[PDB]
Design a protein around this ligand. Structure first.
Ligand SMILES: [K+]
Ligand SMILES: [K+]
Ligand SMILES: [K+]
Ligand SMILES: [K+]
Ligand SMILES: [K+]
Ligand SMILES: [K+]
Ligand SMILES: [K+]
Ligand SMILES: [K+]
Ligand SMILES: [K+]
Ligand SMILES: [K+]
Ligand SMILES: [K+]
Ligand SMILES: [K+]
Ligand SMILES: [K+]
Ligand SMILES: [K+]
Ligand SMILES: [Mg+2]
Ligand SMILES: [Mg+2]
Ligand SMILES: [Mg+2]
Ligand SMILES: [Mg+2]
Ligand SMILES: [Mg+2]
Ligand SMILES: [Mg+2]
Ligand SMILES: [Mg+2]
Ligand SMILES: [Mg+2]
Ligand SMILES: [Mg+2]
Ligand SMILES: [Mg+2]
Ligand SMILES: [Mg+2]
Ligand SMILES: [Mg+2]
Ligand SMILES: [Mg+2]
Ligand SMILES: [Mg+2]
Ligand SMILES: [Mg+2]
Ligand SMILES: [Mg+2]
Ligand SMILES: [Mg+2]
Ligand SMILES: [Mg+2]
Ligand SMILES: [Mg+2]
Ligand SMILES: [Mg+2]
Ligand SMILES: [Mg+2]
Ligand SMILES: [Mg+2]
Ligand SMILES: [Mg+2]
Ligand SMILES: [Mg+2]
Ligand SMILES: [Mg+2]
Ligand SMILES: [Mg+2]
Ligand SMILES: [Mg+2]
Ligand SMILES: [Mg+2]
Ligand SMILES: [Mg+2]
Ligand SMILES: [Mg+2]
Ligand SMILES: [Mg+2]
Ligand SMILES: [Mg+2]
Ligand SMILES: [Mg+2]
Ligand SMILES: [Mg+2]
Ligand SMILES: [Mg+2]
Ligand SMILES: [Mg+2]
Ligand SMILES: [Mg+2]
Ligand SMILES: [Mg+2]
Ligand SMILES: [Mg+2]
Ligand SMILES: [Mg+2]
Ligand SMILES: [Mg+2]
Ligand SMILES: [Mg+2]
Ligand SMILES: [Mg+2]
Lengths: 128, 384, 61
RNA sequence: GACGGGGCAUUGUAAGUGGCAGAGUGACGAUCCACUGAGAUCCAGCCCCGUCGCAUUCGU
RNA sequence: GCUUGUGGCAGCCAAGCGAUAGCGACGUUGCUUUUUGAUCCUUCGAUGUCGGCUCUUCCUAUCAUUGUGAAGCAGAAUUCACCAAGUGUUGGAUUGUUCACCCACCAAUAGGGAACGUGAGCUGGGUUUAGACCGUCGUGAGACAGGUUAGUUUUACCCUACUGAUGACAGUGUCGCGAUAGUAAUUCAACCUAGUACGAGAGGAACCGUUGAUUCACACAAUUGGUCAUCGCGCUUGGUUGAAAAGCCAGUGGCGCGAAGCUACCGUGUGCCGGAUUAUGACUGAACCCUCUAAGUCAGAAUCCAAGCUAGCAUGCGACGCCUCGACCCACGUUAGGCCCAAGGGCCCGUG
RNA sequence: CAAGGUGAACAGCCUCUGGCCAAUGGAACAAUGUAGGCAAGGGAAGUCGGCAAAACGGAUCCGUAACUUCGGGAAAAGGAUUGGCUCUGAGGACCGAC
């Protein structure tokens, strides 16, 4: 994956775009990133994160689970020189092997997300 | 006691002292190693930074996600009209290092380059090289010139050409004083170098005799001045809390009790910018030759008739009429700043080095606003 | 060149290497020429009411 | 050099004149339309070119 | 500061465990001064006493990363050891903490010093003034090393140090040299290798190549983003100039957009070649068949030195242009070799 | 003693009478300050501690919980509206004002 602008640091709460029952995901860390002193770990589209569920089904709450960011509000530059952003920040609950916990996705997803995650790409409606 | 957490130090100690450069024109600190098997050629050039624009091209790079897809890339335009050779300088080896052996100057020197030898050209009698030019008239004088050249062929180990720019071709520079530099000849034997540099006297050497398309070059210049600056901007340290008495834009601890001195490694406030910098591995995307189709900003895919200059001119520079280089990325210094271009010191055996650039589109919209037209013709046809 | 786009708000041409692309929540792609046309449409101004846009000139001619 | 002209750019259609446009009221009347992508500004650190100007020292 | 009992770290022997892969009882020798004691040498006409934040250097008793040796090392993983301090060692919940303990990421989340680094750098949560509660104690006033809550953090213009800025040093200017000083890059992933080597199986590497990313550094503004007193344009509240047009006041009246300049891992670009070696593994080879060593050689690293990059008033130097007491004496090279066995010689009116 | 406008208002803001431009001046916009602002994406991850700042705010209509010493809580919470212009209706005295 090419570098993208990071828009979602730790403690960001994003919409849940799947149908598992969760309403929002609270990002507690971003996988794969080693840190710097005082820098907040930050995620972008196509990153797997560790999150909890603050609103949603009781059985989904109070546990740490993986998720992948599918939509981000922070504009990022594509290689063709166009800056892109979404209306909201969204993510989908997955397992550590990358498989979607749910079955259906609400709204569009990024092309950067679909390229990395074939199972999320298969369940997506529109890939912009 | 040890510091509670580790982070790397702010800034590099390898660019010390962060002072104002003692020169304005960037200086070549090391020429490429001479290979006597290759033909004689120049190793450097002088140019002027006109401005920036962006290009679109299709990338051929197997294994990349950008393969067979178009990319947008920012480019710097450097206007490089031909240099005039006006002299030769020889160097001999010595246990203390290289030493200038002798120099020979041409009979005709323009007043643009002769202004370089004066602090006040218009108050002087302009006598520089007036008596030196008399050696080319008599016969004993011509004997000295030939004897100096023969001394060059026998004793020199390094031969350099003395060349100056034609600074009056760029009217927007508003300067009559030419820039003068020494350029090394890096081919053949010493006799080959002396013969090659002597045949160029009072002659124009174009940028295509020195560089070619898709070549990695090094750019030398002085960065933009910024004056006195605090530690936060000069060195990139972090700000203190809002609650900090006597201000928050400082380094909190500037050293321990022992050693009982401030160290050279601690960030302090002072001059920021206007530093000498040598930046390497900048690819040449285009060589615009005056009087040829390559000078226009049209590509094989875009047949629109337009010039390299953006609508309304290059901001703070003017119109590019002479030869120029398109170079990927940014370049040292502000607009109008003289920049030294040098051949790479190392072998460029790499994919990025050996990639062949094919331009698809060159933006020529105005850079003085949110420009939306590519030409003045298109703007007038749009409004009627 | 040939692959040039139109602004969704102002209806003007966009050349390669520029453009702001906004994806609405219902998978609608809005391409904007610059920051002015993007700030409008986010302040909810209708392009038919601004005299300098393509839509306004089309309705008024 | 000072103006000026053009290029480029920002805002968004000027004043004025006219209209059997305009809720209604007894001539008034927000607003709308035309002249009008108009008007205004644009180097002060943007680009290109008809009117007017223009004392103190130093000898290797 | 001395000491090192206690704290921490490292050895010797080898009964045992599984003798010395890895461990190791009973004994026994040390080292260290980030523990705590012991002492009372310095300071009471005062050296600002906890902790954290910030910032730089230093150590090695090495946690990861580089190169290796060993295994009860099939692979994968792990453990022991060596050369090594070049580069890293993070984001959080509770707590004033130091210490701790959990969540998570990571290649890894090693340990420490610098007046228990760092208060004319901050902060002031804790300790520890005066107000006030409680418990226990006291006849009482009051005490508590128990808890609780509220409680002023002063000065730099001096010298030095450090960061930058001018500058004389026998004309003036241009182009150069380069002693010396500084220094920098870093780590991870994906793909192919390959479901291959190995293995009964379950499992399961790696080099080369390619493509990216992390941390850092140095620039830059074509685009995106930010910034407005362009007071640039528009709209608008209250007042005011008899109205209208045009403005002004409300210290920037307010709102919208806003070029230019500045600027962001919030944007873009770039970041480096040779030699010597450590560890170790070897060649030839005696001593004395063997032997990496005795002589003589080789390969060898996140190492070192160069190169490159920054400075260069190094009171250093080169080239060019322009002119107001006889002071006598040239071999290279070798000493387990080229007559020599030291210029301990030779030359010179050496004489006025 | 104490005017006009806006406004509920001796609030704030502007103006008339009257009074003043006295607070050393000039040149330039470095760092660090002091006072005052804005800032994409995130939203307390900062810190002993949301310290500081931001958000709320006038009026009209709807609607308002636990608990309660029955007085409160309460402006609880939670929603909607507000400009300009042209009119219309109602509310009086012996022609007028809101
Ligand atoms: K981490
Ligand atoms: K410390
Ligand atoms: K920077
Ligand atoms: K900070
Ligand atoms: K008008
Ligand atoms: K119009
Ligand atoms: K001890
Ligand atoms: K004392
Ligand atoms: K108080
Ligand atoms: K060096
Ligand atoms: K800007
Ligand atoms: K001279
Ligand atoms: K200031
Ligand atoms: K907090
Ligand atoms: Mg912190
Ligand atoms: Mg440490
Ligand atoms: Mg050099
Ligand atoms: Mg304070
Ligand atoms: Mg611009
Ligand atoms: Mg003009
Ligand atoms: Mg100017
Ligand atoms: Mg002990
Ligand atoms: Mg024992
Ligand atoms: Mg004393
Ligand atoms: Mg002191
Ligand atoms: Mg004192
Ligand atoms: Mg060691
Ligand atoms: Mg280290
Ligand atoms: Mg200590
Ligand atoms: Mg201390
Ligand atoms: Mg203090
Ligand atoms: Mg303190
Ligand atoms: Mg101190
Ligand atoms: Mg306190
Ligand atoms: Mg007390
Ligand atoms: Mg009692
Ligand atoms: Mg207290
Ligand atoms: Mg097999
Ligand atoms: Mg008016
Ligand atoms: Mg007034
Ligand atoms: Mg105000
Ligand atoms: Mg950057
Ligand atoms: Mg042997
Ligand atoms: Mg050895
Ligand atoms: Mg070797
Ligand atoms: Mg009164
Ligand atoms: Mg009123
Ligand atoms: Mg009042
Ligand atoms: Mg005063
Ligand atoms: Mg003053
Ligand atoms: Mg913000
Ligand atoms: Mg939020
Ligand atoms: Mg916290
Ligand atoms: Mg914290
Ligand atoms: Mg706490
Ligand atoms: Mg507050
Ligand atoms: Mg309440």
């Amino acid at each position: 994956k090419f570098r993208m602008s990071l828009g979602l640091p730790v403690a960001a709460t994003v919409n849940c775009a799947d149908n598992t029952g969760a309403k929002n995901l609270y990002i507690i860390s971003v996988k794969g990133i080693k840190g710097r002193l005082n820098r907040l770990p930050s995620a972008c589209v196509g990153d797997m994160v560790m999150a909890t569920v603050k609103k949603g089904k009781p059985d989904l709450r109070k546990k740490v689970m993986p998720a992948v960011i599918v939509r981000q509000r922070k504009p990022w530059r594509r290689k063709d020189g166009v800056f892109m952003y979404f209306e909201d920040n969204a993510g989908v609950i997955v397992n550590p092997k990358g498989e979607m916990k749910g079955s259906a996705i609400t709204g569009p997803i990024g092309k950067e997300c679909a390229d990395l995650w074939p199972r999320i790409a298969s369940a997506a409606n529109a890939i912009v | 006691s040890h510091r509670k957490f580790e982070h790397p130090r702010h800034g590099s100690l390898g660019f010390l002292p962060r002072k104002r450069c003692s020169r304005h024109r960037g200086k070549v600190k090391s020429f490429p190693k001479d290979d006597q098997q290759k033909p004689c050629h120049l190793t450097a050039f002088l140019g002027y930074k006109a401005g920036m624009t962006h290009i679109v091209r299709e990338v051929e790079k197997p294994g990349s996600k950008l393969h067979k897809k178009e990319t947008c890339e920012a480019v710097t335009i450097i206007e490089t009209p031909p240099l005039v050779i006006v002299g030769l300088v020889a160097y001999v080896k010595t246990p203390r290092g290289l030493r200038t052996l002798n120099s020979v100057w041409a009979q005709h020197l323009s007043e643009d380059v002769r202004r370089r030898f004066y602090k006040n050209w218009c108050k002087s009698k302009k006598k520089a090289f007036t008596k030196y030019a008399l050696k080319y008239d008599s016969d004993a004088g011509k004997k000295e010139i030939q004897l100096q050249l023969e001394k060059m062929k026998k004793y020199a180990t390094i031969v350099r050409v003395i060349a100056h720019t034609q600074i009056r071709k760029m009217k927007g520079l508003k300067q009559k004083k030419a820039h003068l530099m020494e350029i090394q000849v890096n081919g053949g034997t010493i006799a080959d170098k002396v013969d090659y540099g002597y045949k160029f006297f009072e002659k124009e050497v174009p940028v295509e005799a020195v560089f070619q398309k898709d070549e990695m070059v090094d750019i030398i210049g002085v960065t933009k001045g910024k004056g006195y600056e605090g530690v936060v901007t000069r060195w990139g340290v972090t700000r203190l809390p809002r609650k900090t008495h006597r201000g928050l834009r400082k380094v909190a601890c500037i050293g321990a009790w022992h050693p009982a001195r401030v160290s050279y490694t601690v960030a302090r406030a002072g001059q920021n910018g206007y530093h000498h910098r040598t930046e390497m591995n900048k690819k040449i995307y285009k060589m615009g030759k005056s009087g040829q189709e390559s000078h226009e900003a049209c590509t094989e895919f875009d047949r629109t008739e337009k010039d390299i200059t953006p609508m309304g001119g290059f901001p703070h520079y003017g119109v590019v009429k002479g030869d120029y280089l398109m170079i990927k990325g940014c370049c040292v210094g502000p607009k109008k700043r003289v920049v030294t271009l040098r051949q790479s010191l190392l072998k460029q055996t790499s994919r990025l080095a050996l990639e062949e650039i094919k331009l698809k589109f060159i933006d020529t919209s105005s850079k003085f606003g949110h420009g939306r037209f590519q030409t003045t013709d298109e703007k007038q046809k749009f409004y009627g | 060149v040939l692959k040039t786009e139109l602004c969704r708000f102002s209806g003007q041409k966009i050349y390669p290497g520029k453009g702001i692309r906004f994806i609405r929540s219902d998978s609608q792609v809005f391409l904007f020429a610059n920051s002015k046309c993007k700030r409008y449409f986010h302040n909810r101004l209708k392009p038919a009411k601004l005299c300098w846009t393509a839509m306004y000139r089309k309705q008024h001619k």
